[PDB]
Amino acid sequence: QWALEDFEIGRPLGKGKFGNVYLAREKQSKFILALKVLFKAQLEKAGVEHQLRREVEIQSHLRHPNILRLYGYFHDATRVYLILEYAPLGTVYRELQKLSKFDEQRTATYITELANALSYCHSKRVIHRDIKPENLLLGSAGELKIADFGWSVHAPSSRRTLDYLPPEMIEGRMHDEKVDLWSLGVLCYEFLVGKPPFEANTYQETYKRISRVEFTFPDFVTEGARDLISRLLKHNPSQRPMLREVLEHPWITANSS
Ligand SMILES: O=c1[nH]c2cc(O)ccc2n1-c1nc2ccccc2[nH]1
Numbered sequence: 001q002w003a004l005e006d007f008e009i010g011r012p013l014g015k016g017k018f019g020n021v022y023l024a025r026e027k028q029s030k031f032i033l034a035l036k037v038l039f040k041a042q043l044e045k046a047g048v049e050h051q052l053r054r055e056v057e058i059q060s061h062l063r064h065p066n067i068l069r070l071y072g073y074f075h076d077a078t079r080v081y082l083i084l085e086y087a088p089l090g091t092v093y094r095e096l097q098k099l100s101k102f103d104e105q106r107t108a109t110y111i112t113e114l115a116n117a118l119s120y121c122h123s124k125r126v127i128h129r130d131i132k133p134e135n136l137l138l139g140s141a142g143e144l145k146i147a148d149f150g151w152s153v154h155a156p157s158s159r160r161t162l163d164y165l166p167p168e169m170i171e172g173r174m175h176d177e178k179v180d181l182w183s184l185g186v187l188c189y190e191f192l193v194g195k196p197p198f199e200a201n202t203y204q205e206t207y208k209r210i211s212r213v214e215f216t217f218p219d220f221v222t223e224g225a226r227d228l229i230s231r232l233l234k235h236n237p238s239q240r241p242m243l244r245e246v247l248e249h250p251w252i253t254a255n256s257s
Pocket of ligand 1: 013014021034036084085086087088089090091137147148
């Protein structure tokens with residue numbers, strides 16, 4: 001029940017791969033939100049119509065204050081518009097750019113907020129699979145909001161950025177909700193250090209490094225954090241913790257809230 005006519009388009013917020021995300025306000029209501037404009041010429045030529053259908057079917061059903069809301073979708077001849085929660089303070093990516101590292105209180109908080117989002121996701125049997133700072137957003141009160149469910153699915157799978165991908169995904173093997181735990185470790189490490197634990201200059205070095213769980217900690221990383229990151233980045237996914245173990249990790253609990 002929506003058309004472009006119902007919106008005034010403000011500034012472009014982010015320049016994505018298949019289109020951009022614009023600030024915008026609904027007209028009858030004066031409601032501020034984000035409008036993500038994908039258009040089909042590129043989507044079909046990339047053959048990802050069903051990836052987008054899952055992104056929608058999933059992100060609509062989910063409601064959680066640490067997950068970006070998708071109020072709905074619509075389309076015309078050329079474009080498909082996603083009507084999205086507007087998150088004022090931008091991405092964690094941009095925040096990490098400004099501040100080469102986060103401290104342990106900011107980092108641990110973001111993780112508790114992220115864990116909640118995930119334990120809710122994994123409760124609905126949904127996996128995100130593309131957690132990274134680019135796909136985390138920040139509400140008006142600084143709160144963390146996961147977005148961009150482009151690579152989400154239900155239950156197990158195979159298929160198959162790459163810094164945040166686990167061995168089971170890149171190597172080709174099948175995988176589950178455990179990927180989001182590996183990614184959470186990558187992400188925790190990056191927050192504290194300022195770069196992902198397996199970063200390389202070429203794809204092929206990164207594959208090998210990820211495959212062999214080849215990462216070292218700086219001197220300045222505390223053992224509490226070292227512990228949680230080491231537990232999350234285990235090659236054998238089964239070994240990686242439950243989300244609640246992470247939420248009730250002493251280092252986390254010390255530094256969260
Ligand atoms: O509010 C936002 N919703 C978004 C959805 C997306 O898929 C990607 C970016 C979104 N976004 C947003 N808010 C911003 C605020 C400042 C700078 C960039 C932003 N992107």
